[PDB]
Design a binder for these strands. Structure first.
Ligand SMILES: Nc1ccn([C@H]2C[C@H](O)[C@@H](COP(=O)(O)C(F)(F)P(=O)(O)OP(=O)(O)O)O2)c(=O)n1
Ligand SMILES: [Mn+2]
Ligand SMILES: [Mn+2]
Ligand code: NA
Ligand code: NA
Length: 325
DNA sequence: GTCGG
DNA sequence: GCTGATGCGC
DNA sequence: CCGACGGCGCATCAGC
């Protein structure tokens, strides 16, 4: 509400850069700008005022003035009314269709969902599921449903082996009232970095399939599964939307570093890493390691919980819900 | 497009 | 058939 | 003024 108009136009520009211009860094530049401006507690009155914020520079300051004055961006009005551009940008909303496939589809007259359905034979497996669940994939997941989704995965994993440890991370773990998808982190005492188990993820994915929880597969290997799941319907009522689910199998010795990382948020991760640095540690998704006087990173430290990582860098344990930043 | 080195 | 590159979505 | 900006796992392609 504060600066929704500006953050909207920045977002739109970001998407044009990513899907049409194929300029992924300008995509992140516009988004970062949109994020800082979104957290800013006043209604912006000039470009110069926005420029004081980290991530907003000369050109965004220039666009903000154009918008504050005239209500629009000449550059966006033009973009909206190029057929190629808006078609390419739209097609990218299909999972498995990125800038490259989108531009290629539009190049041969394929511009809409209708055209994709007419041309199924031109789509790879991932893209077909993306097309099939197009509306379902753009829908958020209420927290109430996340909880039922969690019960199902936790219990089914328990049934396969009591030694498995599974954690639902992402915004859900941070306490959000809605999530984009479900990201499951999985480990086993048998799986470490040192270790010689090409069936650990599989056992779990096939159990989820057997109880009809997982319905489709996007990609699946020995460490990562990406697919589609669905809550069982009432036996009476409206059947549930299909949801994206990801399952990652991580060595036990790197498991709590992974939980930390995949819980985020991004800015929290960024701040944590910076503080660690100041304390003589380098944290990444897999490990925390002591830094040497010359900057050389030592061996991975023993981590048996998330709290362990906070102790190393002398930070009071931060509740997931307090990791917005 | 914006940044820090 | 093999390998490394590219596209994709986290 | 300059290159960095995240980079990993998996699926498919490109070029032998
Ligand atoms: N492209 C990515 C995305 C994520 N992550 C890791 C690093 C991130 O800390 C973590 C979660 O990403 P997140 O914070 O964005 C999210 F999913 F939880 P949020 O979008 O905020 O909520 P919601 O799904 O409802 O839209 O995964 C990553 O390594 N690469
Ligand atoms: Mn600078
Ligand atoms: Mn440059
Ligand atoms: Na897409
Ligand atoms: Na070929």
């Amino acid at each position: 509400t504060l600066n929704g108009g500006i953050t909207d136009m920045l977002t739109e520009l970001a998407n044009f850069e990513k899907n049409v211009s194929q300029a992924i860094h300008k995509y992140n530049a516009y988004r970062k700008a949109a994020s800082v401006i979104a957290k800013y507690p006043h209604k912006i009155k000039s470009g110069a005022e926005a420029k004081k914020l980290p991530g907003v520079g000369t050109k965004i300051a220039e666009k903000i003035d154009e918008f504050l004055a005239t209500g629009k961006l000449r550059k966006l009005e033009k973009i909206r009314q190029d057929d190629t551009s808006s078609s390419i940008n739209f097609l990218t909303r299909v999972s498995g269709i990125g800038p490259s496939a989108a531009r290629k589809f539009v190049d041969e007259g394929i511009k809409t969902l209708e055209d994709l359905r007419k041309n199924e034979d031109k789509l790879n497996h991932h893209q077909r599921i993306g097309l099939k669940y197009f509306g379902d994939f753009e829908k958020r997941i209420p927290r109430e449903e996340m909880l039922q989704m969690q019960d199902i995965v936790l219990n089914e994993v328990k049934k396969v082996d009591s030694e498995y440890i599974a954690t639902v991370c992402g915004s859900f773990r941070r306490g959000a009232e809605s999530s984009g998808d479900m990201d499951v982190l999985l480990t086993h005492p048998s799986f470490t970095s040192e270790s010689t188990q090409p069936k650990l993820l599989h056992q779990v994915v096939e159990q989820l399939q057997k109880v009809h929880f997982i319905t489709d597969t996007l990609s699946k290997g020995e460490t990562k599964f990406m697919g589609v799941c669905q809550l069982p319907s009432k036996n009476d009522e409206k059947e549930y939307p299909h949801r994206r689910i990801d399952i990652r199998l991580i060595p036990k010795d790197q498991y709590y570093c992974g939980v930390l990382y995949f819980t985020g948020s991004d800015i929290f991760n960024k701040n944590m890493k910076a503080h660690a640095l100041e304390k003589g540690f380098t944290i990444n998704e897999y490990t925390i390691r002591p830094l040497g006087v010359t900057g050389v990173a030592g061996e991975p430290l023993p981590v048996d919980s998330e709290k362990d990582i906070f102790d190393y860098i002398q930070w009071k344990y931060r509740e997931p819900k307090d990791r917005s930043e």
